[PDB]
């Protein structure tokens, strides 16, 4: 297992524009297109991302390319964030993938706001972070996925994904 496989499991893969769990237009492997409620707007952003007139539909290769860019962007985000980088740097490889998962889903900003949880992960108080991580809208809205990522931080193994 790795970060790519991990996210592919959590996000799925859809080749036509669809709405995510929040009702926002997305395509591929969890690539958010826009928070706007306009399909046209989403189509415009899709064509801009791909470089062609897609008519709201992409190929598998194209989805994977977006996915690679998004993963990449998520790591750099972390590395560039003052709150995140130290945590990330203190963790083992497995747990780092869980932190990337969160940032891909919620953005750097939203994750950087889990202050208490961040501090517990940094301190290696696994069970404690896991309880504090569950006290969140994230957990209440997407409990199964949140469960898998939390288990990941708690155990440092890929057990939740196997
Ligand atoms: Cl893009
Ligand atoms: Cl879920």
From Swiss-Prot:
TM spans (from-to): none
UniProt xrefs under SUPFAM superfamilies: Lysozyme-like (SSF53955)
Record flagged with keyword Membrane: no
Variant or mutagenesis effect after changing residue 30 to A: Almost complete loss of enzymatic activity
CDD domains per record: T4-like_lys (cd00735)
Consequence recorded when altering residue 117 to I: 500-fold decrease in enzymatic activity
Protein's GO biological process: cell wall macromolecule catabolic process; defense response to bacterium; peptidoglycan catabolic process; viral release from host cell by cytolysis
Location in or out of the cell: Host cytoplasm
Coiled coil segments of this chain: none
Keywords: Antimicrobial, Bacteriolytic enzyme, Cytolysis, Glycosidase, Host cell lysis by virus, Host cytoplasm, Hydrolase, Viral release from host cell
pH-linked activity: Optimum pH is 7.3.
GO cellular component terms attached to this protein's record: host cell cytoplasm
Record-listed E.C. numbers: 3.2.1.17
Reaction(s) the record says it catalyses: Hydrolysis of (1->4)-beta-linkages between N-acetylmuramic acid and N-acetyl-D-glucosamine residues in a peptidoglycan and between N-acetyl-D-glucosamine residues in chitodextrins
Function recorded in the entry: Endolysin with lysozyme activity that degrades host peptidoglycans and participates with the holin and spanin proteins in the sequential events which lead to the programmed host cell lysis releasing the mature viral particles. Once the holin has permeabilized the host cell membrane, the endolysin can reach the periplasm and break down the peptidoglycan layer.
Family to which the UniProt record says this protein belongs: Belongs to the glycosyl hydrolase 24 family.
Listed name of the protein: Endolysin
Native source species: Enterobacteria phage T4 (Bacteriophage T4)
